[PDB]
Amino acid sequence: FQSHMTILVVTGTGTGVGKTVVCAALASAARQAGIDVAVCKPVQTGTARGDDDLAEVGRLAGVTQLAGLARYPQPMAPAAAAEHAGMALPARDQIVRLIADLDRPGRLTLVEGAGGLLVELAEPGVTLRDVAVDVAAAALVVVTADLGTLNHTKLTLEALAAQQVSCAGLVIGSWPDPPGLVAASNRSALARIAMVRAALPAGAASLDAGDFAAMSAAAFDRNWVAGLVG
Amino acid sequence: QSHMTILVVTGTGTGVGKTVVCAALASAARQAGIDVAVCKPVQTGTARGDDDLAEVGRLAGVTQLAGLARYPQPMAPAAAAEHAGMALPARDQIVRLIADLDRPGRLTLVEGAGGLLVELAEPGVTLRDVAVDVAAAALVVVTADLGTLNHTKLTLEALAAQQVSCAGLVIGSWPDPPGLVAASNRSALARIAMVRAALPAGAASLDAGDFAAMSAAAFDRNWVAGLV
Numbered sequence: 304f305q306s307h308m309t310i311l312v313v314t315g316t317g318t319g320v321g322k323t324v325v326c327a328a329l330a331s332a333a334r335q336a337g338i339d340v341a342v343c344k345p346v347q348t349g350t351a352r353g354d355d356d357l358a359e360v361g362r363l364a365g366v367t368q369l370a371g372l373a374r375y376p377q378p379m380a381p382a383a384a385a386e387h388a389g390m391a392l393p394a395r396d397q398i399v400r401l402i403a404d405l406d407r408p409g410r411l412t413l414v415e416g417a418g419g420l421l422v423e424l425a426e427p428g429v430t431l432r433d434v435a436v437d438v439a440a441a442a443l444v445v446v447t448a449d450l451g452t453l454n455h456t457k458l459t460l461e462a463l464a465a466q467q468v469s470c471a472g473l474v475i476g477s478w479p480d481p482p483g484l485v486a487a488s489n490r491s492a493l494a495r496i497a498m499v500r501a502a503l504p505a506g507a508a509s510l511d512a513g514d515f516a517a518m519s520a521a522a523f524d525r526n527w528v529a530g531l532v533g
Numbered sequence: 534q535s536h537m538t539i540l541v542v543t544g545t546g547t548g549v550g551k552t553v554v555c556a557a558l559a560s561a562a563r564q565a566g567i568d569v570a571v572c573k574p575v576q577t578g579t580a581r582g583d584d585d586l587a588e589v590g591r592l593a594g595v596t597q598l599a600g601l602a603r604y605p606q607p608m609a610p611a612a613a614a615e616h617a618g619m620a621l622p623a624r625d626q627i628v629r630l631i632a633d634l635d636r637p638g639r640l641t642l643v644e645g646a647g648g649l650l651v652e653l654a655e656p657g658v659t660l661r662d663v664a665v666d667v668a669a670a671a672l673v674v675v676t677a678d679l680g681t682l683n684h685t686k687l688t689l690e691a692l693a694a695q696q697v698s699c700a701g702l703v704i705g706s707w708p709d710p711p712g713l714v715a716a717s718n719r720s721a722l723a724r725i726a727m728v729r730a731a732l733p734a735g736a737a738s739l740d741a742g743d744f745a746a747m748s749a750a751a752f753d754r755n756w757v758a759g760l761v
């Protein structure tokens with residue numbers, strides 16, 4: 304049996320691709336599968352505009368094990384948000400510790416990044432990619448089905464591979480109904496580049512505890528969710 | 534070549550103002566007494582208006598305008614090709630086209646479709662691969678918007694992963710007034726790499742005389758002159 308937690312860093316090809324709702328949905332599916340979930344957001348910016356990804360995940364999925372660290376008021380890159388506040392970025396070891404303290408046998412721990420993969424989270428130039436290497440995490444990458452997604456996905460996967468960070472698959476953060484030409488062909492093209500784990504219905508974030516759990520359980524292959532933790 | 538006579542002009546993504554950058558650099562080079570050609574081997578979204586070579590011709594006065602395939606649907610070349618049922622060009626086609634344009638005294642700009650890793654030719658051949666084959670450097674068009682730092686770093690990593698040189702960045706559209714994020718991103722980008730130009734928001738709608746004035750001001754003429 305597995306004596307330690309499975310760690311996934313949940314990154315995105317950019318900003319506003321749906322990382323938070325994806326963390327919530329995977330947490331919900333895993334919880335319904337009988338797996339204990341912790342969600343972790345080591346660096347949060349935009350707190351002065353109300354942003355709070357951990358609180359949204361608690362709302363959406365009913366997750367109680369929520370682990371935060373740094374929060375910066377302005378909705379910018381951590382470096383700039385920290386500077387604007389007259390604060391500093393956390394150290395690399397603080398982020399790693401925040402994650403490692405969550406360790407339980409057979410737990411699934413989701414670590415949500417701020418923006419995309421190479422955003423600086425700690426000094427100097429420490430990114431979510433470095434953190435994933437420190438903790439031996441795999442990366443789940445949230446993508447859109449919009450024009451431009453194929454270049455961003457491939458850039459992101461190449462950067463994971465460059466530091467031997469394993470790819471857990473793609474999740475389409477928002478999937479339109481009905482899907483247009485571009486969206487439909489993008490979903491097929493994305494599925495040639497990597498496994499597409501889920502494509503969450505557009506508007507999922509505005510669902511409600513009951514419907515969100517139902518959406519979440521239908522959205523992932525149960526065989527993949529089941530295998531996450533042993 | 535002993536000079537940077539070929540630049541591929543890529544972007545961090547779609548809608549970053551790549552064409553207007555190509556036009557503004559062509560215009561600035563022309564005004565530096567340099568001969569210019571612009572090549573856009575593969576073009577999509579034509580049916581919805583787009584002929585990027587024509588807008589370069591119009592904005593910059595460029596007559597040496599070269600391309601190979603134009604697709605109606607505003608899609609990735611690969612998807613547009615599949616939809617039309619008409620395959621993309623081959624690698625050697627794009628590469629030779631570019632290499633034949635290349636001349637001493639001339640700046641040859643190659644505009645990609647979308648970002649760096651978009652498939653332009655058969656099979657899975659990207660602008661990065663083309664740049665490798667022709668020993669070109671890459672000029673990178675970026676936004677000043679939230680998200681640009683990740684996308685820029687990702688693009689520069691992908692360039693360096695195949696050892697294609699960074700000749701620098703251009704901000705395709707520089708807002709007015711900047712605003713907090715854009716302002717910070719401009720200095721952050723400058724830490725990452727040299728910013729060759731920041732093209733004022735709205736530059737794409739200027740007629741040729743105003744566009745020429747903007748372009749001459751936008752770039753360092755000594756840098757531009759040095760290319761050839």
Ligand SMILES: C[C@H](N)[C@@H](CCCCCC(=O)O)NC(=O)O
Pocket residue numbers: 449450451452453454455547548575576577578606607608609610645646647648651
């Ligand atoms: C329609 C766009 N304007 C562009 C093609 C963009 C392809 C993006 C593919 C992707 O990365 O998802 N076409 C072009 O530059 O000719």
Ligand SMILES: C[C@H](N)[C@@H](CCCCCC(=O)O)NC(=O)O
Pocket residue numbers: 318346347348349377378379380381416417418419422678679680681682683684
């Ligand atoms: C403000 C955003 N929502 C996000 C930070 C995005 C930084 C993007 C930096 C960049 O790549 O330019 N913050 C966060 O997820 O806490």
